């Protein structure tokens, strides 16, 4: 599978998430344009690139 | 004296703080 | 009985085997004190 790298730019606070899963608004690197919200598990700062296997599916809440 | 040690005040200063081949008995005569 | 303590038991031929059995059967007169019992 083609894995892709993508840089976070904003950690969305105040969303109703599962404890231990923080939503984030990541954006790709092959083009610097199209953004996608994902949900990451570990501690995440701003602008540290993370890896994505799925390329198109948007994230949601975790109840 | 333990109380004065716990209050030592580490910046005190005064003028006074600037500074064999023989037997036993004849070392005293030597000195 | 004068055997190197890592020369393992597949070795140790008959003169040393007879010697160590002789030590274990005559243990008094080999300069071993009352440590023995």
């Amino acid at each position: 599978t083609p894995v892709t790298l993508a840089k976070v730019i904003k950690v969305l606070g105040r969303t109703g998430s599962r404890g231990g899963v923080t939503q984030v608004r990541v954006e790709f690197l092959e083009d610097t344009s199209r953004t996608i919200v994902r949900n990451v598990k570990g501690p995440v700062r701003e602008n540290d690139i993370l890896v994505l296997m799925e390329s198109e599916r948007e994230a949601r809440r975790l109840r | 004296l333990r109380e004065k040690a716990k209050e030592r005040n580490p910046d005190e200063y005064y003028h006074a703080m600037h500074s064999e081949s023989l037997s036993m008995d004849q070392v005293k005569l030597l000195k | 009985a004068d055997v190197d303590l890592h020369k393992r038991a597949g070795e140790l031929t008959q003169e040393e085997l007879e010697r160590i059995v002789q030590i274990m059967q005559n243990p008094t007169h080999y300069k071993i004190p009352a440590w023995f019992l």
Binding site: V40, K41, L50, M53, E54, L62 | - | -
Partner: protein
Amino acid sequence: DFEVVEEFTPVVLATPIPEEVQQAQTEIKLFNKWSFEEVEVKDASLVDYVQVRQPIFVAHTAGRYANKRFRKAQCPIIERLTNSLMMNGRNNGKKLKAVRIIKHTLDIINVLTDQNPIQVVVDAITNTGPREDTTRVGGGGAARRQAVDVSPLRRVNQAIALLTIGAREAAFRNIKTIAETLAEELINAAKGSSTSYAIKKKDELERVAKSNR
């Protein structure tokens, strides 16, 4: 052409310093054996979370590296490796024991497969650390999983924990010990052989994530 001379006398101190030490004074090698130059992280997204840009002499730089959130991602990768390796019930605070077994470990991965041992441990970390993961979503009581991603700090942390606990499980009580079994498990995880416990656990975690994504 170009020339710069700074010292002029042959500097020899009155105490005789060993020749390997006064050779190491030119460029700091790890354990006076391994250069932190020419070590690059072949993967992206784990640079600035491993840290191989500071040539240290021994993995015992005891500075305060834990009283912030992210400032345990800047002490070097082999110091994090030996500090994660030091812990069990039989040993806590046995860090000179942990340093000497990491010394034997990287020495014998040199004598087997000479790339250079810090290069081997760094791309071992990158191949070990998983990339997708599952969490327990609530659902009122249903045991449904859900697929999330992992930040690079979580990837590096879980990578060093998986390597260390894999060497623990591989020399709990059998023939070898922790040094050579960390060597063999780490070279398997560096090559990518899928025979090590680390890549077994990474493939299992990514497989269950792929399954119930």
